[PDB]
Design a binder for this molecule. Sequence first.
Ligand SMILES: [Cl-]
Ligand SMILES: [Cl-]
Ligand SMILES: [Zn+2]
Ligand SMILES: [Zn+2]
Lengths: 30, 30, 30, 30, 30, 30, 21, 21, 21, 21, 21, 21
Amino acid sequence: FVNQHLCGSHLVEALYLVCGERGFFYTPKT
Amino acid sequence: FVNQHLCGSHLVEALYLVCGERGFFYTPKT
Amino acid sequence: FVNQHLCGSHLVEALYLVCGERGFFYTPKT
Amino acid sequence: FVNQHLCGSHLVEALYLVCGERGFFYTPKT
Amino acid sequence: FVNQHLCGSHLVEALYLVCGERGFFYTPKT
Amino acid sequence: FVNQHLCGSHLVEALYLVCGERGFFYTPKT
Amino acid sequence: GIVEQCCTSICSLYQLENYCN
Amino acid sequence: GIVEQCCTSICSLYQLENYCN
Amino acid sequence: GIVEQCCTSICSLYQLENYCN
Amino acid sequence: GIVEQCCTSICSLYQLENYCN
Amino acid sequence: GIVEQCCTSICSLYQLENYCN
Amino acid sequence: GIVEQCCTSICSLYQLENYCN
Ligand SMILES: [Cl-]
Ligand SMILES: [Cl-]
Ligand SMILES: [Zn+2]
Ligand SMILES: [Zn+2]
């Protein structure tokens, strides 16, 4: 795998693919 | 607004839209 | 709901979620 | 080009691609 | 059709729509 | 990581994620 | 309409231009 | 959970706020 | 207009809702 | 090919690297 | 190349079509 | 945090995996 540059909703898409049925949490600053 | 079926990556894109800076937790397993 | 920062195709995704079966119109300047 | 099935958010992403600055109108109800 | 300004994953979405079942190759610099 | 069904534009978004700068080739016909 | 033409059935990028402004 | 409420069934944007932090 | 406002500044879902049919 | 491996069936992110250049 | 052109400047669908198999 | 790191700099899939449940 390659390193990623992910902003906005693209981060959530990546988390989705990475975590699968495990799900994930999205927790930005502030 | 409306009610539709939101599944998979579309579900998490909707959570991102609705929650934004609050963040959110995607737990399919419940 | 939280305020949004939406460019390009992300605006159309948001309109899609917001409007549901009502549909919408996308009308940029110029 | 090609012909494929374009549904939901994928349909409006395609309209955005094809129409761009012209804008477009997504009316599922017809 | 209109001219496009496409970065990141939006380029791959456009290639997807454009090429259909023919598929495509994605080949960035470097 | 996980295994899920990845189809259509979601498949090519995953290839973009995984391959990135290497690039990739989407050949549905095989 | 667009759903029947492009989702239920199959449409080209050119038919999709039917729904531009 | 969220899948049953919003994918299998149908949910509003307001119900989706149930899963915010 | 809305297209530019949401991108150069910010916009709300309630403002977006005005563009539904 | 990729469709059968990853869409029709199920594939890992590692199998997806099979289609990188 | 195309990847950079579409992002730093603009590109057409007709230019993209050259990258189909 | 991760949300900001992936956007202002870069991040890996392995770092993202830490945010799975
Ligand atoms: Cl889908
Ligand atoms: Cl973007
Ligand atoms: Zn984007
Ligand atoms: Zn989809």
